[model samples]
Target: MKESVVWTVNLDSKKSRAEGRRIPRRFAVPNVKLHELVEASKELGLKFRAEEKKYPKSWWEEGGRVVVEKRGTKTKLMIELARKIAEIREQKREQKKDKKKKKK
Candidate 1:
């Protein structure tokens, strides 16, 4: 038996260190949505949490990274992700209009 080493990607810098050099992040999502995040974590893989509610709603507040009560999880990445969900939907909606306009 070797060992179980758990290392996570740097949420900000987008790098993981190894061999005294930076390794490009293995996880890449150009953008993420609330539904996508919830979907990814929902699976048991056969999985991980307590104090979680009926799926997405519970996740909407907590997510995966960290949580704070009064101050809140007001991290830059967290705020960006929250903002992105709405923009992504709106971005898609505008596309429908273009599709309606013409194929070309």
Candidate 2:
């Protein structure tokens, strides 16, 4: 079986700088490769910065938020695609299980 994976992309934040200033940011799911996601963000005329640490960090802590200058429609679409992929993977797993039961 193929391993299922989740990828996420945040479109709102473009560039990274010192704190205390308002910057745009977005969050995505499915966890895409950090470098690829960052490049995509650049193509859209935005900058992408990854926090050194993984989830539950200072930036992602509950109630932590950044201001976005504009909304990112493309990024949102990418997130939706990731979700759909996860759903499809689950469906395939169920089908495989059913087939095995029928064979047995």
Candidate 3:
């Protein structure tokens, strides 16, 4: 089984570090290296600052979030989004079918 992940981009906000925080997070793109994801995001113009100061180049081990300004164009990201939407659609359709069955 391939790991469906892009990269573990940390967040900058204090709340982001909160374990009990309500907000939660994606089908990370698989088969791609962490560094590659960074380069791709940069090339595609995704506005995000890596936790590491020299990330996408140097190791981003500074324990920080990849602050985002915008979601750039990345084939992997788009593909993952499409898959997730399809999965949700399938779930919704099944749920609707279930409701119909219950009402019948």
Ordered by TM-score, highest first, the candidates read: 3, 2, 1
Output the number of the TM-score-best candidate: 3
User: What is the C-alpha lDDT profile of model 3 across 42-68, one tens digit per residue?
Assistant: 554643334444455555433333333
**lDDT for residue 104 in candidate 1, whole number 0-100:** 58
Per-residue lDDT of 1-104 in model 2, one digit per residue for the tens? Answer: 11212223232122223422122233322223333444443444433333333456654423122122223444444444333333443445577755856764
Q: Rank the candidates by lDDT, best first.
A: 3, 2, 1
- TM-score, candidate 1, is 0.23
Tens-place lDDT digits, model 1, residues 5-78: 11112121233243221222333232333443333224422111123345566235332331212222233333
| Stronger candidate by lDDT (1 vs 3) | 3
lDDT of candidate 1 at residue 43, scale 0 to 100: 43
Q: Native-vs-model 3 lDDT? A: 0.37
* Clashes per candidate (backbone, < 3 Å): 0, 16, 7
Q: Mark the regions of model 1 whose C-alpha exceeds 4 Å error after superposition.
A: 1-79, 97-104
Please give me the total number of clashing residue pairs in predicted model 2: 16
lDDT agreement of model 1 with the native: 0.32
RMSD of each: 13.1, 13.1, 13.7
